[PDB]
Write a protein that binds this ligand. Structure first.
Ligand SMILES: [Mg+2]
Ligand SMILES: [Mg+2]
Ligand SMILES: [Mg+2]
Ligand SMILES: [Mg+2]
Ligand SMILES: [Mg+2]
Ligand SMILES: [Mg+2]
Ligand SMILES: [Mg+2]
Ligand SMILES: [Mg+2]
Ligand SMILES: [Mg+2]
Ligand SMILES: [Mg+2]
Ligand SMILES: [Mg+2]
Ligand SMILES: [Mg+2]
Ligand SMILES: [Mg+2]
Ligand SMILES: [Mg+2]
Ligand SMILES: [Mg+2]
Ligand SMILES: [Mg+2]
Ligand SMILES: [Mg+2]
Ligand SMILES: [Mg+2]
Ligand SMILES: [Mg+2]
Ligand SMILES: [Mg+2]
Ligand SMILES: [Mg+2]
Ligand SMILES: [Mg+2]
Ligand SMILES: [Mg+2]
Ligand SMILES: [Mg+2]
Ligand SMILES: [Mg+2]
Ligand SMILES: [Mg+2]
Ligand SMILES: [Mg+2]
Ligand SMILES: [Mg+2]
Ligand SMILES: [Mg+2]
Ligand SMILES: [Mg+2]
Ligand SMILES: [Mg+2]
Ligand SMILES: [Mg+2]
Ligand SMILES: [Mg+2]
Ligand SMILES: [Mg+2]
Ligand SMILES: [Mg+2]
Ligand SMILES: [Mg+2]
Ligand SMILES: [Zn+2]
Lengths: 103, 201, 119, 156, 65
RNA sequence: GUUGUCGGCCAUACUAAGGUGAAAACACCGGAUCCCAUUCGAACUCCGAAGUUAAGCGCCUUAAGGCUGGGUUAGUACUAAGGUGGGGGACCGCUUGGGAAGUCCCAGUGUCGAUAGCCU
RNA sequence: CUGUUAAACCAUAACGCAGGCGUCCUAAGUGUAGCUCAGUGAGAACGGAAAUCUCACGUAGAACAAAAGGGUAAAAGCUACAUUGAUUUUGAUUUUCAGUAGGAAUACAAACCGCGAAAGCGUGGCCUAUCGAUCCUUUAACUUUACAAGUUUUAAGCUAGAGGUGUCAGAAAAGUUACCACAGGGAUAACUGGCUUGUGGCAGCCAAGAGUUCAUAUCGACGUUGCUUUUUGAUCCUUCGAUGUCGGCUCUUCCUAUCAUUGUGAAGCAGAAUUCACAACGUGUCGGAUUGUUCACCCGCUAAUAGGGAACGUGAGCUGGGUUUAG
RNA sequence: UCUCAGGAUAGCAAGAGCAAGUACGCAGUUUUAUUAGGUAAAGCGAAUGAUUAGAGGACUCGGGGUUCCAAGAAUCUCGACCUAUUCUCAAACUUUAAAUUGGUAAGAGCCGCGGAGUUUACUUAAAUGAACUCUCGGGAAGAAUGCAGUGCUCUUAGUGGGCCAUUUUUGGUAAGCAGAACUGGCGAUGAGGGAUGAACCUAACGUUGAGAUAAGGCGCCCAAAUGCACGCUCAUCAGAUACCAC
């Protein structure tokens, strides 16, 4: 799929349509200190082998993309989900119109 | 060996034609429906003898070719090829199947083709001159014996393979109302555009 | 008549004589009284329930019945469904329509004979 | 049935009627609808939006709301031996007015008229309609056509 | 194992057993499926209509306006 | 009687080869400076007024094709309820109800409008 | 998920038919404008069956990502241009339905926009498939909390996306047992019996032909009507708190689709031998090689060395070679 | 639902209650009014798909053989294109199109572009519309038939392997096989009849007498006709009847 890096859309803070930089979403790491990590560790200490289950059977070949939009005007951030895709290419509107002209 | 005809006799199915839903349905052993002098004019062979299936059943194509070949040899030898037009009215459209571990799914491959016949459907038709009517009636009867159960033999008062009664046919002869194509006759109505009728030539 | 199409094989209907009607109401007469099943004996009853309609008497009943006058409906509902007897004549064949020598259908005029057998 | 989807088994129900291909049908565009009217609901295949579920095609509902492009209608569905009210919203396309009330009003007005006049004259008029009634006695003077049962003949 | 997959046999009769229940015709019906435009109108036209009896303090509000 | 404009129904309106054409309209028609337009002023756009019913278009013509409606088809095929009905069966038929479709026949061939007009 | 089975509302089974889904698309979404496609006839250098250019005719026979069905002609198709409505709030409705969830889609009310003169149309793909909870993590947005008081840093929250469970209402999970075990199951296999009879076996009908001549002495192709339950298969009714599951030996009785013997009819019957048929089991139908064998094959005698049934007759009658515990 | 011998969950069932049991109400019924539908059939000289027969054809699209003489013309053979036809068909074809059947209705909560009101981003150029209120005018009750089953609460048992018949049906050669549809039934159910026997025929059960029956019978076993009249039948293999034993 081809997603334009620049896009005009709604901004809540600006209450109008803004130019937003469009980037893909990135899952960031698990902070060592979240209650979850804490418990996992604490259970797992001592004996009782492994505690929580481990997920062996994974069926999906595709991951739903999260578009991150940043408003140029107000700096605000918003996430939208997109349909399943195997490939994602982001492109400058410049190169997009250039490629459309060539074709 | 081929399964006994008594298996497929009764039409228990809904009709299974050779279709784009049917792969590898074989052919039917009866390929030719006309024998004798096919070139004859309605005038040349006036009388018709029909085999009419009295029963409701499925006749195997193989059975058809059988009864046919038979009737043909009979007629050709005993009168002359010149003297009879033999036509097989019925065609074998229906495909039989045969299921060849256990019952897991029974849907069968294609066994052979059969013609689905209902009570009163004409199986065979022969057209001939008077002197030969009997002979025809004879050979047809014999072909009836190549056949499942009951079928009967009949003489039509219509003209050859035409829809006209010999009387209508004769009147329309007299009045020059008849046009001739082979086994077919055309009748002329008042509904036609005058650019056709012979007179404006 | 349309509502009888469905029951034809389970029942015989016909066109009764006034005589028949009377006979029925004298021998088999019973009345629907505040839900009770009450033998037709006095006329006080016909007055009780139907009096105001102008039915004072068994004979009157029989009249609105045979004429089918202004109030048929109440004249009828007044009359308890008739519990009959075994026919003295056997029925002919109950599988067959009166037309085939059977019993189910309208025996147009003939219902009377049947009633006579049952009374 | 292995598949259940909004349009399953919709083939001949929704196909446009013969020679209806691409009919716009401006009349439906102009029909006026009011909160209390009775609507009959009929799908057209060219217009995909506001399509009712096939079950409701040819049903008669009672109007309930009026939206800009669509009439809210009310129908009922028997489910497990009970009736369940269903609030449908149909785009204008798949809706037409039912004559079931029109007949009623026309009839009523005429009837009422008759009764009022009769009330003027002391004659009580009744509007009750009686079904087919047993035929009155008749005299018949006509030409007799005497038929006899035909012999059997075979036409081949 | 072997079973009978789907039969609808006894279910129809079962359904007719106690009758088919039909809901009650209520003069006043719920507001589902009715647009807000119309609804606000109703609210307003009711609040202002004197021929429609309101509560006491309500009429105070209406009569002040 | 007839016309343009916007129409509801969408062949009884369509298709083919013809006849005919008051008036007014509609058109074909003349011309590319201007708004507009294309490879091309063909078209689209603009400006007109030397011609013309030859086109389009109205109205009619065809033992015309099509379409529309009735007739036959036929109480046929199919079908509702009953059957300790018949038949080895396939199937057929008895009693009480509904009831079709093609060949072939005969008729019809656009209708309803609002608006401004022509026929003094 | 589509079309059929499915029997004109809906609904309806089978390891029933024919197929399709875990993707693809910044345009293949959205809008405006113009254009009319598939194909056919006639015509123009190189030019040839097929390149481009023309005209006339073209109800749609073409095209519309993907399977099918439906839908579409001044368009939903083709061309060109513009734009992100594949957006912000909620809630409702329809399909399946426990009328829970989830998936889809629809109609509203508030917005903020895009295209067009404008009406209008846009909350994704013409419509019907293309999808995922609790806990946990991560992210976005918010004068939520850390409970003596504060400031930090850090940590908890509320609303909503994404990370996934395809056994798709969503457990973290490899084999072997003939050394075996328990609860049960005739809801279910292995033997008999039952229904069926395809397959096996045994009979007919028609008569092309074979019989040097001649269809039917004797046979019978192409077709076709049956019978039988000594084959095999199919089904799963009875028996799983057990009906002892191969064969032979022994013995008795029944069948006749008769091998021999009796009396006959028929012949392509000279005799001899043989073949076909009828009344017919009354009596008989043997000795050994090899094989656990049923069967098979051989060596022999014989009037003949018929085919079968009786829980595939016959284990409180044997035998135990085979089959199927533990070496 | 790791769910298939089980659980929940609706449905079916019992008891206790609530409410004015809107009777202008209700209905596994008709009637009447308005309406849906693409199945059966039929249809393929009508679309889609198959698919036999012969003929014609000014104009045709090519092949081959013929002939001549010569390369052309004349001409036999093929098909393709029309011409007028013709044989037999479709569950995944269809113009046409049933029976049986589905919606919604048949009035006091009715009808009538008559009135007066109410509406602060409801509608319109428009007192235009719309929705609700109070008014004005008219309205024998607006089909038959039946009501010894009015509606609703609450609490809860059992059940969740089914099986058979008529008709319709799919797989299968077929099966006392395996699956589905409507109504029953058998299970849960006795009585008389089919000698006999779950699902057939009559018929549904408190204790008991009478009478007249249904289904089926009346030569004997056996209650009741060796009744009274017809037609047909002689078997050295008679025949003797629904579901049924071929
Ligand atoms: Mg009797
Ligand atoms: Mg019965
Ligand atoms: Mg339709
Ligand atoms: Mg109920
Ligand atoms: Mg017609
Ligand atoms: Mg017919
Ligand atoms: Mg279901
Ligand atoms: Mg697949
Ligand atoms: Mg456009
Ligand atoms: Mg489902
Ligand atoms: Mg909008
Ligand atoms: Mg998730
Ligand atoms: Mg065999
Ligand atoms: Mg043979
Ligand atoms: Mg067994
Ligand atoms: Mg024992
Ligand atoms: Mg024993
Ligand atoms: Mg013998
Ligand atoms: Mg022999
Ligand atoms: Mg030995
Ligand atoms: Mg044994
Ligand atoms: Mg061992
Ligand atoms: Mg158990
Ligand atoms: Mg429960
Ligand atoms: Mg109670
Ligand atoms: Mg009443
Ligand atoms: Mg009904
Ligand atoms: Mg209709
Ligand atoms: Mg019947
Ligand atoms: Mg079964
Ligand atoms: Mg039935
Ligand atoms: Mg019944
Ligand atoms: Mg039980
Ligand atoms: Mg019983
Ligand atoms: Mg007694
Ligand atoms: Mg006697
Ligand atoms: Zn912003």
């Amino acid at each position: 799929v081809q997603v334009p890096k620049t896009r005009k859309t709604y901004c809540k803070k600006c209450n109008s349509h803004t130019n937003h930089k469009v980037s893909q979403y990135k899952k960031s790491k698990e902070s060592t200190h979240a209650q979850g990590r804490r418990r996992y560790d604490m259970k797992q200490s001592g004996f009782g082998g492994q505690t929580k289950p481990i997920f062996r059977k994974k069926a999906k070949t595709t991951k739903k993309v999260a578009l991150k939009f940043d408003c140029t005007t107000c700096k605000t951030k918003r996430v939208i989900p997109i349909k399943r895709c195997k490939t994602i290419v982001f492109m400058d509107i410049t190169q997009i119109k250039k490629a459309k002209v060539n074709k | 060996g081929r399964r006994p005809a008594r298996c497929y006799r009764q039409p228990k199915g809904k009709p299974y034609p050779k279709s784009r839903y049917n792969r590898g349905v074989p052919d039917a052993r009866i390929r030719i429906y006309d024998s004798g002098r096919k070139k004859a004019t309605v005038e040349e062979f006036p009388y018709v003898v029909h085999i009419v299936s009295d029963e409701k059943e499925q006749i195997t194509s193989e059975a058809l070719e059988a009864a046919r070949i038979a009737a043909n040899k009979n007629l050709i030898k005993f009168i002359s090829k010149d003297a009879f037009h033999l036509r097989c009215r019925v065609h074998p459209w229906h495909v039989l199947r045969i299921n060849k571990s256990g019952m897991r799914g029974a849907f069968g491959k294609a066994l052979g083709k059969a013609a689905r016949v209902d009570i009163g459907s004409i199986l065979f038709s022969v057209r001939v001159k008077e002197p030969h009517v009997k002979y025809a009636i004879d050979a047809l009867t014999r072909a009836k014996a190549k056949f499942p159960g009951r079928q009967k033999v009949v003489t039509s008062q219509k003209w050859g393979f035409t829809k006209l009664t010999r009387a209508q046919y004769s009147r329309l002869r007299n009045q020059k109302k008849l046009v001739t194509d082979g086994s077919n006759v055309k009748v002329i109505g008042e509904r036609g555009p005058l650019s056709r009728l012979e007179l404006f030539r | 008549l349309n509502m009888i199409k469905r029951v034809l094989p389970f029942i015989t209907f016909g066109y009764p004589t006034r005589n028949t009607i009377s006979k029925l109401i004298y021998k088999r007469g019973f009345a629907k009284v505040n839900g009770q099943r009450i033998p037709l004996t006095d006329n006080t009853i016909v007055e009780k329930s139907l009096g105001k309609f102008g039915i004072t008497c068994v004979e009157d009943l029989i009249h609105e019945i045979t004429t089918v006058g202004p109030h048929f409906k109440e004249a009828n509902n007044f009359l308890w469904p008739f519990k009959l007897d075994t026919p003295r004549g056997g029925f002919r064949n109950k599988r067959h329509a009166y037309h085939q020598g059977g019993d189910w259908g309208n025996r147009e005029v003939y219902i009377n004979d049947l009633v006579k057998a049952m009374l | 049935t292995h598949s259940y989807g909004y349009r399953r088994q919709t083939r001949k129900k929704f196909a446009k009627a013969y020679k209806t291909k691409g009919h716009v049908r401006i009349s439906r565009y102009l029909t006026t609808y009011k909160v209390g009217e009775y609507v009959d609901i009929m799908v057209d295949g060219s217009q995909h939006k506001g399509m009712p579920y096939k079950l409701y095609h040819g049903r008669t509902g009672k109007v309930f709301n009026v939206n800009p492009r669509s009439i809210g209608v009310i129908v009922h569905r028997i489910v497990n031996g009970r009736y369940i009210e269903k609030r449908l919203h149909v785009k204008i396309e798949h809706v037409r007015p039912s004559n079931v009330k029109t007949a009623l009003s026309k009839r009523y007005q005429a009837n009422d008229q008759a009764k009022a006049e009769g009330n003027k004259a002391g004659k009580r008029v009744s509007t009750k309609r009686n079904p087919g009634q047993p035929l009155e006695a008749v005299q018949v003077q006509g030409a007799v056509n005497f038929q006899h049962p035909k012999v059997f003949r075979e036409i081949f | 194992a072997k079973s009978k997959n789907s039969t609808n046999k006894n279910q129809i009769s079962k359904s007719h057993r106690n009758g088919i229940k039909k809901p009650k015709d209520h003069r006043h019906i719920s507001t589902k499926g009715v647009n807000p435009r119309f609804l606000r109108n109703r609210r307003r036209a009711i609040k202002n209509d004197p021929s429609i009896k309101k509560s006491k303090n309500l009429e105070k509000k209406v009569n002040k306006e």
